[PDB]
Each structure stands twice: as C-alpha cells, then as structure tokens.
Amino acid sequence: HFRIGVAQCSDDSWRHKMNDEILREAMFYNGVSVEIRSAGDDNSKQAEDVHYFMDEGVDLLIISANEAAPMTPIVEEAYQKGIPVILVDRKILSDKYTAYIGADNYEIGRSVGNYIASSLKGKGNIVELTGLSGSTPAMERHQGFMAAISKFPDIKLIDKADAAWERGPAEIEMDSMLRRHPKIDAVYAHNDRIAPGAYQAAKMAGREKEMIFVGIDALPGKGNGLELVLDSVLDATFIYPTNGDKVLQLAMDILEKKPYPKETVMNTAVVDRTNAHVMQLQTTHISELDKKIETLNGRIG
Amino acid sequence: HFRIGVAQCSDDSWRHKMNDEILREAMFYNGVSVEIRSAGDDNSKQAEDVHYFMDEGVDLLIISANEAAPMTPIVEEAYQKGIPVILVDRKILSDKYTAYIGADNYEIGRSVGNYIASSLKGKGNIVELTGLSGSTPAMERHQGFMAAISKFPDIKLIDKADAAWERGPAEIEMDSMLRRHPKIDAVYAHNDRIAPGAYQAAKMAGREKEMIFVGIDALPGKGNGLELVLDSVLDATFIYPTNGDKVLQLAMDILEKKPYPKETVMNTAVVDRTNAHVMQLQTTHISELDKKIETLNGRI
Numbered sequence A: 001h002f003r004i005g006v007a008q009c010s011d012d013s014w015r016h017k018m019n020d021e022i023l024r025e026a027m028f029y030n031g032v033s034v035e036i037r038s039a040g041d042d043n044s045k046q047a048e049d050v051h052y053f054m055d056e057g058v059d060l061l062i063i064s065a066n067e068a069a070p071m072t073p074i075v076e077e078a079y080q081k082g083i084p085v086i087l088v089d090r091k092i093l094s095d096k097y098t099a100y101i102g103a104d105n106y107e108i109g110r111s112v113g114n115y116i117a118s119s120l121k122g123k124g125n126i127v128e129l130t131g132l133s134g135s136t137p138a139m140e141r142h143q144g145f146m147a148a149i150s151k152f153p154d155i156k157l158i159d160k161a162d163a164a165w166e167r168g169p170a171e172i173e174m175d176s177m178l179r180r181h182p183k184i185d186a187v188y189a190h191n192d193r194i195a196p197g198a199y200q201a202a203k204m205a206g207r208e209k210e211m212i213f214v215g216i217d218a219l220p221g222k223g224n225g226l227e228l229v230l231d232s233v234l235d236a237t238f239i240y241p242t243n244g245d246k247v248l249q250l251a252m253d254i255l256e257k258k259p260y261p262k263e264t265v266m267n268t269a270v271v272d273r274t275n276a277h278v279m280q281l282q283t284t285h286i287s288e289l290d291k292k293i294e295t296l297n298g299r300i301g
Numbered sequence B: 001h002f003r004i005g006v007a008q009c010s011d012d013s014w015r016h017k018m019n020d021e022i023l024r025e026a027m028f029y030n031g032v033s034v035e036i037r038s039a040g041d042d043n044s045k046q047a048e049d050v051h052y053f054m055d056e057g058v059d060l061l062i063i064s065a066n067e068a069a070p071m072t073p074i075v076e077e078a079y080q081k082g083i084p085v086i087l088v089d090r091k092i093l094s095d096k097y098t099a100y101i102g103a104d105n106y107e108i109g110r111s112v113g114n115y116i117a118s119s120l121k122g123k124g125n126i127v128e129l130t131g132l133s134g135s136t137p138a139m140e141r142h143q144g145f146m147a148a149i150s151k152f153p154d155i156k157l158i159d160k161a162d163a164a165w166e167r168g169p170a171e172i173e174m175d176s177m178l179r180r181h182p183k184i185d186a187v188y189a190h191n192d193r194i195a196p197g198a199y200q201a202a203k204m205a206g207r208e209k210e211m212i213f214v215g216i217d218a219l220p221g222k223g224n225g226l227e228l229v230l231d232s233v234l235d236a237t238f239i240y241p242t243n244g245d246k247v248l249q250l251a252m253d254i255l256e257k258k259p260y261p262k263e264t265v266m267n268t269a270v271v272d273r274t275n276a277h278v279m280q281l282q283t284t285h286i287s288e289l290d291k292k293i294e295t296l297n298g299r300i
C-alpha cells in the first residue's frame, strides 16, 4: 500500500533508537512498509542507497545527509524525479526537499557555550572535538558555541579537531591536546561517543579532574550519555532528540495528502547531575511501555 | 480465571493513576479480573469493602489501609482465612500479611528535611502539615523529617497540624499558623494537595514570597505536583511512585506460585526547578505511549 525508504548516514545506538521508533510507528498504519539502510559514514554508500530507493520506486524518502555538499546533488535528483523527500537531523545546501524535521544544532552549540562559561565562572581554556566537518550538525554545533563564548573575553577556544562523531579519533586527538596544552578547563565534545574518548585520554594522563566534560545526545540505556552523567564521567550533555514517531507521522501526512509543516523544529534540554536521576526513572519506565507495545504488536497477526 | 479485589482507602488523581495502571497491566494476563473499590477515607466503609471481597471469594486482596490500627484485625482476619494480602503504600500495625509494596516514606521524610535545611542554609522556622495522623505514611513522613532536622540546631519546627491529606483542612490550618507566626520560612506539606492549600492561604495573606513550599507525590498532569513546580507554586516535591504495573505483577507472582519478595521498596527523587523540564518532557512522552496502548489493547 505504501513503501518508505530511510537513507541513514551511519549506524549506532542513536540511529538504532530512531529506526526502532519509526518501525514502531509503522505498525499503527495499515499497509506501510519501511526499509532502512546505513551508509556507514560514507558519501558513496549513501548515494548508492538513495539510487537503490529510487530504482525500487519508493513512495517516500527519509534521509539524513552524511555531509551537506556531496549529498545535495543526490537529494535534488530524488526531488526532480518527483519523489517526496524528508530531511532528518542533517541538512543539505538547497531547498529541493519536501520537509525538514530536526533539532536546532546552532542553539545547542550556543547552550553548550553558555553552560561552560557559567561553570568556569567566565574564565578558562576550552578544547573542541567536532563531528565530521562537512555535516551540518558539526558546523552549527561549532558556530553556536563560538557565538556564545564571544560574549566572554576570558573563555578561550585554544584547540579544535574533527573527531568524525566517534570515540576512536576523539582519544587520539585529545592525547595530542593534553600533550600540547598544560592548562585545559573544559572539553566540548559534539556527541556522547566523542566524550568518553576524550575523558579516557584525560583519565590516562592523570588529568580528568582538571576539566569538565560536555557532550550532546543524552540517550538513555547502558553505554550512553545519561549513564555517563550518572557515573560522573560527563558533567553535562544536551538532548538531541530522535523522535522517530514524529518522523513517520510527517511521512504519513504527506503521503495521505493531509496538511503538514514544511519545517518542524524540535527542542533540546541540558542533562546534568541536578536532573539525571529523575530522567533515568522516567526513561526506565519508557523502556517498559515500549516492550509492552512490542508484545502487543506481536499478538496481532 | 483469577479474581482480585482492590480496597483503596481514598479516591483522587494519585489513586486513579495507580488504579488505571493496575487495570492496564491486567489486560496482559489471561482471565484476570480486577474489581476496585474506594473507602472515601472511612475505616468502616473500608472494613465493608474487605468483607465484601471476602464474601465473593476473591483469589487475592490488594489493600491500602486507610489508618493502621482500625484496619489491622480486618487484614489479620483475611490473612488467617488463607487469602493472600498485598499491602500497598499504607501499612497496618502487625507483620501478618503476604507482601508489601510502596516507597520508603521515612526516607522521603528525611530527604524533605535535608532539602529544606539546605535551601534555608541551616537556619529558619518550618511549619508542617501532616497527612492523616493514624496512617503510616504520615507517621513516617513526619518522623523521617524530624530525624533530618534534628541535625540542624538552628532549624525549628514551630507548628504542626493534621491536614488529613487534603487541600481544605490544609488551607484553614495554614491560615491559623500565619496569624500566630510572623516568621515562617518553610512549609512542609505531606502531599501535593495539602501544599496548594497552604500556598493559597499565604498568597491571600500577602506572604507567599516569604517561604518555600515542599510537597510529596510529584504526579504529571493538569492540577498536580509537576505542574505546581513548573508554575513556581511549589519549590519542590518528591516522587511517590504509583507503579500499578508492579503492583499487579506482584499479585500475579503470588497467585502463580512464582518467587516474590515480602518487601518491595520503590524509588523516590526530588522534583524542583532544576529538573522539572526534563521531567515533563519524559512524562509527556510517557502519556502518549499510553494512548498508543489504549489503542492496541482496544484492538483485541
């Protein structure tokens, strides 16, 4: 009845959570088939996945653009070929798409800069470990953060490196920063996978108590951001919401020719020591309501 | 297949949430029938309800003993007769029962005490408005509180009254306290219904900015504790969880002759300005996962 293609820039616990949220919302609509592919952080594979979804003539395309520039031509094709395109989370560099949904990455950066400036009482040295440079969240996470800390002449960005969203490059790059900078008061990590990597670099150099750690994503579950705050590894992290259900509702509104917003902006919030506990109690319950919905879906058919 | 009778002491938004969770959890077991009654805060009516559940031969009894003494023989009776009894939230005076489930009312009390002492920097006058004196949560919430504030020589409890769990008495009692006490630094309310009562008495006397208000329950939804924090009426409230799902799973474990603990202590946490936002984000997401279950359950 309706087939949807999800072209996803990568695969990890954040994507996993969004995917499952989409599929879970699918079963509330009669007919709809959702197919999902990961690009494993590679622009070619993501083209291949988009071309694949175009060959299969899917009714709608959901994509998160790995890097902005290289993927622009490829999304434009799907658009001129008449297929409706939903951009999630990451953006492209033109307006040739049907609808955008995501959280404001610039404002998150701004929030990160303000939180650090407040915590360091207006004075200190920050190092930044970014996501993949050409992706729109890494760009904006940096811009917003620079905008915020410009208002504090004694908060200084003294080093920056591209960690490609991952813990591996984060560790090496943080090693280089520690070696070259005796005074570091804060690490700004673009996600909660970069963050533990930098921390482990600091831990191992006997210097993790000299600085605060800030990340983005704030997922519940083992190995994720919330847990890192509760474990006193991260001082703060910002909710980067997956909202898989609202993504599918958008798809359905478009397909079923219901009205829709062309742009849906989602909110963030800071998560830290003061609020990590109540958040965990609540997400723990969410997990339970989820497996209830999965048990209840299995009993149908 | 199995019949469970639930003898609730009260009816209100807190009880209703637990009642809904219990019913929703029962949909997941085959042939489990749950009948829920409210005593309307009356011991005789609650005695009747248990007696009724006994007469129709329920397989298990869930009870929140309105007051502890009046309800002990009745519970002791249903137990010796061989019906398993689950005590929820409130307790009776003796140990003769199958299992208890609730949160730690004493430690909630202690947390309130610590929170007020910290917020007032170890100096100030507190008024306390208790739940129904003869109920165990009210005894325990007061006693935990005394334990905490005993460690601060400059914190005084200057007045105390039995607000009987409700806004009405709370508002009259606060009113009196305000007239006799020119300096009040904090109000300790035993629940999120007593608190807005105390608050309105203060607001109407032009004094709400002089003190902090601390409550218990911290429920989501219009007119409850989370909203009161969000709206800056309540400075803090503590989570007193309902977890009707856990309550019914405990019933099923006993009836299915599966292993179960006699004592189940559930989690509390403080809710205030610093966490109310992520709190409400999560509950708002929880609330629609419920509508997503009413839909699915209502397609079977």
Ligand SMILES: OC[C@H]1O[C@](O)(CO)[C@@H](O)[C@@H]1O
Binding pocket: A010, A011, A012, A014, A015, A089, A090, A131, A137, A165, A190, A191, A192, A193, A216, A217, A240
């Ligand atoms: O789009 C940026 C987002 O991508 C992720 O790496 C998920 O793959 C997140 O950690 C980050 O917030």
Ligand SMILES: OC[C@H]1O[C@](O)(CO)[C@@H](O)[C@@H]1O
Binding pocket: B010, B011, B012, B014, B015, B089, B090, B131, B137, B165, B190, B191, B192, B193, B216, B217, B240
């Ligand atoms: O058992 C004490 C609890 O009972 C209630 O009054 C609801 O009936 C709550 O407000 C309070 O926390």
Ligand SMILES: [K+]
Binding pocket: A149, A150, A151, A152, A153, A154, A155, A156, A157
């Ligand atoms: K600066």
Ligand SMILES: [K+]
Binding pocket: A208, A209, A210, A211, A212, A213
């Ligand atoms: K640290």
Ligand SMILES: [K+]
Binding pocket: B208, B209, B210, B211, B212, B213, B233
């Ligand atoms: K106040």
